[PDB]
């Protein structure tokens, strides 16, 4: 008969999955696969929190596929190596994927499409990771992605309204389509543990961001309910991970960005009684869309050299200073607490991202945004290659049409956000004995207060790695020199 395979990569969900929906129709068998390769050289920068989140996403998909008398098939290796084997072993004639706009993904999928055509396999590709067809955005702009956010808002406003999200895969949708299964299915296709991937899980606590579609849909309800109770304002509690947080689920595809969009539009129309909401309503959704669009045709989006849209800034190379930043031992408790939360949990507030990005690049250390991006790629759960690269370029003053002239204070920003320093004490236990007057600048604490706090600066917690007033004055001057001769730094 017609034997079909749906290939999960992103879109780790059964709701709003047009590719899986189309693949099942007219099919006699269906197998959903995820191709996992934790040893891939190109994935050497993936942190353990990302691996854990993904594995929890796969367990949730497997559990939800159980409800449809199916299972997830987890397969080890590289798609180019695995798919020809599967095409023959399973006699596959249909393969479905959610479209991937990112350059590496487009390249991989082009190769797989060639293997499928060679094997007599029809390839079904449907767009569902983004709100729009990004290629249509670019065509509407004249063939180039809009290089500014409000130009992007202009084009998007002129587009056709979004079509309804695809129906969720139910028993009545599967119909006669079945999944051939064996009693030993877990031995060959089961979802592995972190330990089974060779990871020592020593030092791991319960995940602050549990993966999966079930979690995402539960959080979506809470998120809308809280919104039922304009751009929000950050306070101290905003720094903590929220049970209403959706951002990692949108990144992995646990939550459909189109479903989220429609639920937001639905809620707005109920409270504000009109169908033309402020683009404010969608929060980061269009920033998300903006960076996917800017990156899709730029294979060097994550680089400075050879990247046509990036300002060629002469950053310093300082591996020791970069390591202090990445490992949260800069000696600035505000910076270190943020980098510690990021490493421990996999999410930090957007304004905390601005703070540590400024400190590393244009503000204090004058280290390339490429190096910050690599660290964030390792640890951050909610930012794809396209969004990470674009965000680091924009925030480091590396885009020609976005400048920041105010340098974040690595003491005052934290003190102004959380005056008592509860955030510091939560993530930097060595500093817990310091009173609020010194918690953001413990080097200013007299020797007696340090001894009482059982924390000698330079012994138990490092001294501040730079003099911020001097470093920022020099770096503000350097950035002013660059933008005074901006065209000279065009590649
Ligand atoms: C520093 O490292 C990172 C920082 C942020 C992220 N990040 N993660 C996600 C998203 C983003 N990024 C942005 O939303 C974004 C928005 C505005 C700008 C900006 O230039 C600007 C202009 C005017 C005023 C204020 C700001 C830059 C970035 C959206 S998402 O895909 O949903 C999940 C990743 C790494």
Swiss-Prot record:
Tissue: Expressed in cones, amacrine cells, and retinal ganglion cells of the retina (at protein level). Expressed in all tissues examined including heart, brain, spleen, lung, liver, skeletal muscle, kidney and testis. Higher levels in brain, liver and testis. In the retina, highly expressed in the ganglion cell layer (GCL) and in the inner nuclear layer (INL). Evenly distributed in central and peripheral retina. In the brain, highly expressed in the suprachiasmatic nucleus (SCN).
Span(s) of short sequence motif LIR 2: 81-86
Main location: cytoplasm
Motif (LIR 3): 150-155
Upregulating conditions: Oscillates diurnally, rhythmic expression in the early night is critical for clock function (at protein level). In SCN, exhibits circadian rhythm expression with highest levels during the light phase at CT10. No detectable expression after 8 hours in the dark. Circadian oscillations also observed in liver, skeletal muscle and cerebellum, but not in testis.
A GO molecular function held by the record: E-box binding
Keyword set, alphabetical order: Biological rhythms, Chromophore, Cytoplasm, FAD, Flavoprotein, Isopeptide bond, Nucleotide-binding, Nucleus, Phosphoprotein, Photoreceptor protein, Receptor, Repressor, Sensory transduction, Transcription, Transcription regulation, Ubl conjugation
Task performed by this protein: Transcriptional repressor which forms a core component of the circadian clock. The circadian clock, an internal time-keeping system, regulates various physiological processes through the generation of approximately 24 hour circadian rhythms in gene expression, which are translated into rhythms in metabolism and behavior. It is derived from the Latin roots 'circa' (about) and 'diem' (day) and acts as an important regulator of a wide array of physiological functions including metabolism, sleep, body temperature, blood pressure, endocrine, immune, cardiovascular, and renal function.
Domain notes: The LIR motifs (LC3-interacting region) 3 and 5 are required for its interaction with MAP1LC3B and for its autophagy-mediated degradation.
Family the UniProt entry places it in: Belongs to the DNA photolyase class-1 family.
This protein's name: Cryptochrome-1
Residues of the full protein shown: 2 to 496 of 606
């Amino acid at each position: 008969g017609v034997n079909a395979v749906h290939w999960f990569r992103k879109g780790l969900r059964l709701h709003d999955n047009p590719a899986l929906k189309e693949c099942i129709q007219g099919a006699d068998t269906i197998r959903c696969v995820y191709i996992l390769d934790p040893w891939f050289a190109g994935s050497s920068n993936v942190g353990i929190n990302r691996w854990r989140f993904l594995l929890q996403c796969l367990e949730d998909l497997d559990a939800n596929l159980r409800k449809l008398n199916s299972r997830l098939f987890v397969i080890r290796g590289q798609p180019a190596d695995v798919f020809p084997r599967l095409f023959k072993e399973w006699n596959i004639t249909k393969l479905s994927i959610e479209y991937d706009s990112e350059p590496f993904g487009k390249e991989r999928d082009a190769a797989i499409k060639k293997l499928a055509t060679e094997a007599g396999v029809e390839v079904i590709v449907r767009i569902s990771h983004t709100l729009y067809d990004l290629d249509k955005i670019i065509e509407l702009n004249g063939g180039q992605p809009p290089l500014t956010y409000k130009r992007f808002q202009t084009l998007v406003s002129k587009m056709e309204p979004l079509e309804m999200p695809a129906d969720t895969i139910t028993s009545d949708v599967i119909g006669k389509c079945m999944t051939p299964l064996s009693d030993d299915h877990d031995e060959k296709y089961g979802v592995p543990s972190l330990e089974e991937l060779g990871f020592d899980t020593d030092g791991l606590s319960s995940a602050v961001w549990p993966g999966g579609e079930t979690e995402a849909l539960t959080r979506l309800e809470r998120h809308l309910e809280r919104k039922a109770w304009e751009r929000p304002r950050m306070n101290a509690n905003s720094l903590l991970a929220s049970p209403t947080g959706l951002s990692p689920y949108l990144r992995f595809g646990c939550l459909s960005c189109r479903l989220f969009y429609f639920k937001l539009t639905d809620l707005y129309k109920k409270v504000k009684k009109n169908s033309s909401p402020p683009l404010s309503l969608y929060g980061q959704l269009l920033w998300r869309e903006f960076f996917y669009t800017a990156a899709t045709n730029n294979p060097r989006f994550d680089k400075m050299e050879g990247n046509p849209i990036c300002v060629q800034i002469p950053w310093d190379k300082n591996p020791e200073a970069l390591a202090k930043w990445a490992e949260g031992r800069t000696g600035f408790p505000w910076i270190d607490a943020i980098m510690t939360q990021l490493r421990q949990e996999g999410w930090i507030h957007h304004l905390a991202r601005h703070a540590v990005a400024c400190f590393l690049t244009r503000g204090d250390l004058w280290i390339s945004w490429e190096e910050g991006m690599k660290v964030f790629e390792e640890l951050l759960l909610d930012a794809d290659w396209s969004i990470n690269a674009g965000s680091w370029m924009w925030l480091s003053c590396s885009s020609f049409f976005q400048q920041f002239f105010h340098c974040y204070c690595p003491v005052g920003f934290g003190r102004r956000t959380d005056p008592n320093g509860d955030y510091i004490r939560r993530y930097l236990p060595v500093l817990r004995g310091f009173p609020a007057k010194y918690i953001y600048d413990p080097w200013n604490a007299p020797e007696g207060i340090q001894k009482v706090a059982k924390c000698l600066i330079g012994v138990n917690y490092p001294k501040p790695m730079v003099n911020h007033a001097e470093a920022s004055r020099l770096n503000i001057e350097r950035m002013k020199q660059i933008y005074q001769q901006l065209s000279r730094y065009r590649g």
